Symmetry: D2
Subunit: 336 residues, 4 copies
């Protein structure tokens, strides 16, 4: 039985000790400490060698990504790429710390756009009329000048032209994940999440890739250059296979919506994830999938009965960098 | 004596409010129980009750606009939109998260679609499949607190405070597999290029049951957009089927052209959005293509503080051009299972005669 | 096992049928239906006669309120008196439908002030600087001109003078509940909750009665006329005795904070309430009492183990009038 | 070709933002782990991380103001406030809900009070009693989902995801009863007029344990206001005691005079408010008596939509005069158990040398 006790600042500002004290502080601080433990368990499993029998089975996919003892799925909503958490995610992907990414369309396009032009701090209360008159788009307390999207149009159009040519003359069958890998290769910039993902053979799933600016551009482009097809069925097979042939799986899910369900549903195909951490601000009372507790997913078989999943009820912009500091960043040498 | 600065701060003079200002006043049960008067009184009750009254006004404005007669070239409209649905004076987009189809709000939505009262539906995959499954087997009431281990051991899946037996999905599998066979054959030999909306129309025709939202949608030529249709049980089934019968393709690009042109070629648009996520953004982003919706009502339980699109206020969408600057949008902060049936009672259901 | 099914508007707008369909609609609609059942159970118990043995025990208080078979505690936060729910609460109190009220100071003073001047509709987004320059105070999307409080000052000061005289020359020992009864008698207006409460011998508890405009006025008054004492200890005995000697109890609690805990803690003194409905927008994850589920209160003994309590997760301005329509208002004849 | 109006709506020209505008950028872990730099990066990370950075700035402004030297008549200050606490250049009010004392935030608050870093405390009754009880017996970690029936049968009480055995309250009873006896005797024969703040100071002196917030508060002459002190276990004990030893009176009127005069006679004020309810309103309303606080930070999980005072934004308080129009208040939307220790690390704990 563990006693409640907070960090005592009479000891000085010992930042590691302060963070490690969250576990005994209670409420969501305790859930943060539990999340640190769960992610560290994923990492320690990941670093365990594959036995001969385990290697045989894990090698049954067509994937170029090296085999590990724990396949980690990282999901995040689009707004987290608008935020500075883009840098946190890029770091994990750059160093091969996660194996599959799932995000919505905004979470793809805004990483690419940030290589062309920055996003700025604003305020939630700024009024839409005056912003629109100035072509300034609001994302929470952030601001994206519309010229950012004009730069995206100029950059993306020639790539769409080549994609259509490759589809029609080289037999390429595009899907969202294949498009995202191509966009990461084209942006060719080490600040980009998707640059590192394609370099490191980390697939990115986004079934509704048309829901955002990428969609706007595909739409406009289709009038001049018709017939681009983005198939979602092949991408379903691809994500599900990553779960089916994993030795173990962990889910780190920031936010809700399609990203959260799509990762969890893939893990149902193996009778459940072994480890799971949710960080989101949704609540269960509305019946939403976004707000469902991890234990709802246990009823479906998306999380194993013997797992010890954790949800932190908080804005991931506050929590996720601290979580990374106490988990992946402490094992950086093992990943290089 | 009392400190003068404190008196001055607490007892500061006030300006007179404009004469049009509306007083707060709740329904008086000394009148008895007249439910219409009770609902009308939400407007002057304050907080989200006042927002409910404002939502009633906005939806009624959409409906009144829709019923205004129109004079338009049916052939040009059809070519540019590639739709058989005739244009009206206000195109209404209705969006809802999947869980609302698990709930009894499925019946509320089915009524609106049955009577051709809305023009475009957007929902996530669960919101398609669970309407079909409900024609094969029911969903049951439960509790949020039921533990996952014991539910899983008994083959019961939890959706909030609702419960769906595994056997419901077995029935779905048996029903769907022969249809998927036909869709692959039609793709490979009859040139069909499947998209989510085309699939959803076919599934509605196949279920052939007037309790189904999607049966009525296809009968009335109301398209359904769901760009992540693989995220759910229908996806599971497509996945398993593809190892027995390879080849099915679902394209999302053509469906983007279809939804966006519905907005571009509208005379006026309204958005009624229940919940957040893809459904909310996809409707709003289509309306950016016309420089904004003319009317908008959100009913959702999300909050803005996390930066999410789900929790963004309507005024965020104004900054993008998704809602017109001159619009008067409304958000009700509430579970739609409580509010949406009341909203329909005071809006679409009062105009039943005009829709016939 | 009950099947999910919503109201079918092909039947027409049959408002009673529509409301009764919430029970099978799911999510918070189902909790609303359960709340209707729980409140109706309180009412049916209340209307049951007292046996000889039950009457003997219930009669052991000094209270002038007639005995019933279920003592109903109604609690509400101050903002609900700012809202139109003030009319809903006044109706229940006017017709002797509840037995004990608990509210915070705002929930007392704003009922009295509404007899002097109205509150108006506004918007949540109105900026404070321009409002303050005009002396307009904001309560959510409502507005109270500061002249309303100036009218309160003119009305309340002479009453405070008499209270101090009665304390010093007639031995009166004031407490919040005794002050609230006096203010209700003085306002002498059938639109007032507190007028009806004192007329019907329904006590009102508000231990922090100084936290609001009433406090402002007591504060200013104390410089000219010092020494008014408001004792909270006697009022603790008074509320607790109402629970201890009840045959049965029900709790209807709108909102959180002191109101919710104070009612629940009184009911711990009898080893728990028999019936309980919470309607509030708080969530449990922060460890708050406001956000605690009814089942937390069961661990303390504030709600009986055999009770079937209900929480509706919603703004009470939407839910409470509907709840009253389906419960107390249908039994109005029994209360007159 | 693409519809011209759609192109014009989506590709609208943008104005240039001011040169001072701050770019969004997260901490780069390629630098390694420097926790100070990590916390500093919250300012440019966005959403509530940015609000955290703004809260650090506001609290540091309060502290820097407090440390500015002052020249003031100690005798006049004392008479008008009836307090022995000397005036500083900024009077800081710290408020917290009771559950935060159940949590480990008790240690965070105790540190600030031990070092005389804040001037006025406001908490509800649980926030008083649980600090004292923690000197007699610990609180334990649990889970939110534990069922009430089984906990009650085993004599364990739940506070969120924390657990307190019944025996903790038995120990409290045994400790408190003789003190209540002395308080009644002092009231009836030594003229003591008890109020909540006076009682809390006495309980802190009696507990005589440096782990206690209230021990340090009374040693440093930091008053504690709690106008509903009867709403909790201390109330239970006063209630039971009164049938063995009648007569104890707790007056709230004198405590209103004491807290309000702390605000009226301040040179400058700051408010740091964790949570909502009475604690938030009582601090803010005291500051209306000076026409508003100069600095304010809220950390709470409430939302505005329900009209609640708990969920009101700082800008609502500006409309009342509780926060000055020229102030730059901040709200962080988060559980204070996560955020408050980080805030203290970056503010008060960096100024330890100046406070000694
Ligand atoms: N920047 C953007 O928001 C953006 C840009 C372009 C397109 N879109 C589109 O909007 C659609 C909806 O977006 P979505 O489903 O990715 O998520 P969303 O932003 O609607 O969020 C879904 C839920 O995730 C949780 N969440 C959100 N932000 C969080 C945070 N900071 N911390 C913790 N939890 C959080 C919340 O409970 C929220 O209700 C997507 O299709 C997307 O492409 C969004
Ligand atoms: N029954 C199911 O929930 C179900 C079934 C199969 C698949 N899925 C999959 O889960 C994914 C995510 O679902 P989604 O983004 O459609 O929604 P979601 O359930 O994740 O909800 C998104 C947001 O909408 C709002 N919302 C939800 N329920 C609400 C209510 N009752 N009233 C008002 N607002 C409400 C909430 O703020 C929530 O955070 C989808 O891809 C879907 O296909 C869900
Ligand atoms: N009109 C006012 O708000 C007002 C006026 C004067 C003084 N005050 C003072 O403010 C203090 C704090 O107020 P309080 O504790 O009464 O409550 P509060 O307004 O702080 O609300 C407490 C909690 O109750 C719940 N709640 C609030 N409004 C709700 C609604 N419409 N529906 C459902 N749940 C809701 C919320 O979870 C909230 O966090 C009191 O001491 C009071 O006297 C308030
Ligand atoms: N441990 C206890 O909670 C406890 C013990 C004994 C008595 N009580 C009694 O319960 C009553 C109500 O308590 P209260 O109004 O002080 O607070 P509360 O716990 O009811 O909280 C009020 C509001 O403050 C905010 N809040 C709560 N916890 C938070 C957190 N961790 N981080 C950020 N914000 C948070 C929330 O919005 C909440 O709705 C008091 O009279 C108290 O004495 C409580």
């Amino acid at each position: 039985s563990t006693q409640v006790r907070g960090y005592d600042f009479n000891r000085g500002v010992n930042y590691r000790a302060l963070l490690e004290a969250f576990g005994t502080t209670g409420f969501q601080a305790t859930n943060f400490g539990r999340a640190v433990q769960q992610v560290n368990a994923m990492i320690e499993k990941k670093l365990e060698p594959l036995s001969q029998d385990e290697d045989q089975h894990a090698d049954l996919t067509q994937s170029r990504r090296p085999l590990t003892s724990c396949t980690i799925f990282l999901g995040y909503t689009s707004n987290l790429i608008s935020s500075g958490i883009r840098e946190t995610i890029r770091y994990l992907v750059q160093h091969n710390m996660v194996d599959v990414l799932v995000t919505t369309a905004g979470g793809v396009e805004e990483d690419l756009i940030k290589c062309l032009a920055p996003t700025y701090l604003g305020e939630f209360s700024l009024r839409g009329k005056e912003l629109r008159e100035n072509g300034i788009n609001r994302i929470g307390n952030l601001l994206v000048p519309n010229e950012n999207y004009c730069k995206f149009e100029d950059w993306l159009m020639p790539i769409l032209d080549q994609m259509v040519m490759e589809q029609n003359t080289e037999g390429v069958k595009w899907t969202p994940s294949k498009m995202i890998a191509r966009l990461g290769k084209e942006i060719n910039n080490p600040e980009s999440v998707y640059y590192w993902a394609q370099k490191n053979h980390i697939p990115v799933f986004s079934p509704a890739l048309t829901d955002g600016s990428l969609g706007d551009m595909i739409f406009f482009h289709s009038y001049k250059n018709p017939g681009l097809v983005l198939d979602i069925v092949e991408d379903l097979r691809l994500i599900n296979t990553q779960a089916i042939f994993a030795k173990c799986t962990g889910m780190i899910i920031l936010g809700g919506g399609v990203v959260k369900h799509h990762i969890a549903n893939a893990n149902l195909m193996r009778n459940g994830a072994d480890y799971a951490v949710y960080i989101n601000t949704a609540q269960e009372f509305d019946g939403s999938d976004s707000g469902a507790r991890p234990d709802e997913a246990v009823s479906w078989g998306k999380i194993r009965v013997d797992a010890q999943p954790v949800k932190v009820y908080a804005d991931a912009s506050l929590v996720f960098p601290l979580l990374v500091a106490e988990t992946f960043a402490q094992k950086m040498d093992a990943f290089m």
